[PDB]
Amino acid sequence: ASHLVLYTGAKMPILGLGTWKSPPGKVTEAVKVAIDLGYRHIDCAHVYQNENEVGLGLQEKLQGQVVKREDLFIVSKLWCTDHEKNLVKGACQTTLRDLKLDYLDLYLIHWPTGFKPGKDPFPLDGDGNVVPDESDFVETWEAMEELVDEGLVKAIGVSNFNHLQVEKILNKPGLKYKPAVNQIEVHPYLTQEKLIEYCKSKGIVVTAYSPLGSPDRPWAKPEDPSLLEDPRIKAIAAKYNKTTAQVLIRFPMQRNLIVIPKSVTPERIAENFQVFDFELSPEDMNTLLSYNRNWRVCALMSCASHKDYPFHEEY
Ligand SMILES: NC(=O)c1ccc[n+]([C@@H]2O[C@H](COP(=O)([O-])OP(=O)(O)OC[C@H]3O[C@@H](n4cnc5c(N)ncnc54)[C@H](OP(=O)(O)O)[C@@H]3O)[C@@H](O)[C@H]2O)c1
Ligand SMILES: Cc1ccccc1CC(=O)Nc1cc(C)c(S(=O)(=O)NCC(=O)O)c(C)c1
């Protein structure tokens, strides 16, 4: 519809602004423009290194009475070097101060993999492998639970977790709050029909990230598949009087999933918002779902050997 409901009752905006790779000196204005066009959901993370700049845009719009804190849905995430129980609260407070907020609407464990603690976000060894830590994400979750108890966050969830890892939390003895969301990569080349189905059956909302394939990702190579430049999608896109992107955003929304496309360009930030006026054909929906080639543009290959790497499993 226009929003989905988490198992806690909270209404979560079906659409949101993504901020990974949004330069600090451009993200403040992108947030400002979005809050002005109608966006009420902003997706952030400590590891993006721009939460401070994101916090300024929110502060200015909240101070100008343009938007009420309670109509805003702000999400952030706990980074891998902060999985150790005693390190979780600090990381949450840091993100809170940087964004200039009293609480978060949703706080997610970024990846199931914990890295050796430190200032370096990706601590590698001589072989270019990321160094892991001595923690399990089940103990990290218990600390995420305290956050709710103290009112620092309204809800907690996971990101890039496989159905077996989620199950590990769902069956944790002494479990207080279960995950409300699972943010995962979902685009035509990776429709995730199985993980979504598993999540839904458990009452967990699914947020789809990189809905456009993330053509601006660092590792993207000249010979890399392109979702925005695919004749087929452009075809269904043309017959709708919309753009490839506008349809790529409607697709995950029609499947009952939350989407968070990213753009620091005001014109696209508005076009990304022009997707609540139309609909896709039950067949058009099927044509897209069929392009699934299990191709993830985000597989953290440097973590492939981590005991908790999530992508060795089917789903
Ligand atoms: N939880 C996780 O591990 C995870 C992983 C990956 C991504 N994410 C999240 O999902 C968000 C989106 O994913 P992403 O940044 O990887 O990629 P994305 O939104 O799929 O793609 C971003 C690219 O699309 C362009 N674009 C946006 N709207 C467009 C439009 N209407 N027409 C043509 N081009 C357009 C952007 O350009 P400009 O910006 O230059 O306009 C940008 O280079 C992130 O910012 C982040 O919040 C989360
Ligand atoms: C290290 C580096 C330096 C200069 C240019 C590119 C890169 C590679 C790079 O950007 N790696 C990378 C960084 C982050 C920060 C993530 S991530 O895990 O943060 N992405 C998930 C998200 O957007 O939340 C990933 C997967 C790769």
The gap from C-alpha 305 to its chain's centroid, in whole angstroms, comes to 23
Domain that holds residue 261: 2-315
Distance CA 196, CA 185 (A): 11
Tokens for 91? 């990381």
Q: Which two tokens stand for residue 218?
A: 């660092």
Is 300's C-beta closer than 6 angstroms to any atom of ligand 2? yes
CA distance 94 to 60: 20
Of 15, 20, 48, the one to substitute when testing ligand 1's pocket (max ligand atoms within 8 A of C-beta) is 20
Give the resolution in Å. 2.2
Half-sphere exposure of 14 (CA within 13 A, CB side): 17
Q: Are 114 and 80 in contact (CB under 8 A)?
A: yes
Cα–Cα distance measured from residue 23 to residue 234, given in angstroms and rounded to the nearest whole number: 29
User: What residues are paired with 12 via a beta bridge?
Assistant: 4
298 C-beta closer than 6 A to ligand 2:
yes
**CA-CA distance, 282 to 284, in Å (whole number)?**
6
Contact 159, 109 (CB under 8 A): yes
Amino acid type, 253: M
Q: Helices in 114-254 by DSSP H: which ranges?
A: 137-149, 163-170, 193-201, 231-238, 244-254
What is the β-pairing status of strands 41-43 and 17-18?
Answer: parallel
- In the block, residue with structure tokens 């839904």: 200
> Rounded CA gap, 303 and 40, in Å?
34
- Closest C-alpha residue for ligand 2 atom 10: 218
In a 3-state reduction of DSSP, which class is residue 158?
Answer: strand
Rounded to whole angstroms, how far apart are CA atoms 135 and 123? 15
Q: Which of 80, 128, 169, 184 is nearest to 305 (CA)?
A: 128
Cα–Cα nearest to 13, from 214, 276, 224: 276
Q: Do the annotations mark residue 304 as ligand-binding?
A: no
CA dist., res. 83 & res. 113, Å (int): 8
Alpha-carbon dihedral angle through residues 9, 14, 15, 16, given to the nearest 10 degrees? 20
Q: Which distant-in-sequence residues (6+ apart) come within 8 Å of 222 by Cβ?
A: none
- Specify the CATH number for the domain of residue 134: 3.20.20.100
Nearest to 164 by CA among 314, 7, 59: 314
- What is the C-alpha separation between 53 and 257, in angstroms, rounded? 28
Distance of CA 170 to the CA centre of its chain: 21
Give the pairing of strands 156-159 and 11-13.
unpaired
| Active-site position among 48, 107, 198, 209 | 48
The residue whose two tokens read 């993006």 is 48
Contacts (Cβ under 8 Å, ≥6 apart) of 242: 250, 274, 275, 278
Experimental method: X-ray
CA distances 262 to 31, 210, 217, 269, Å, are 11, 8, 11, 8
7 given a catalytic annotation:
no
Helix (H, G, I), strand (E, B) or coil at 248: helix
Burial of 206 (0-12, 13-18, 19+ CB in 10 A): buried
The domain tally of the chain equals 1
Quote the CA–CA distance of 220 and 175 in Å, as a whole number. 40
Contact 156, 169 (CB under 8 A): no
Gap from CA of 78 to ligand 1 centroid (Å): 20
Q: What Å distances lie between residue 313 and 162, 173, 179, 213, CA to CA?
A: 7, 24, 20, 22
DSSP secondary structure of 80-129 = GGG-SHHHHHHHHHHHHHHHT-S-BSEEEES-S--B-SSS-SS-B-TTSP
Residue 235 tokens read as 């075809």
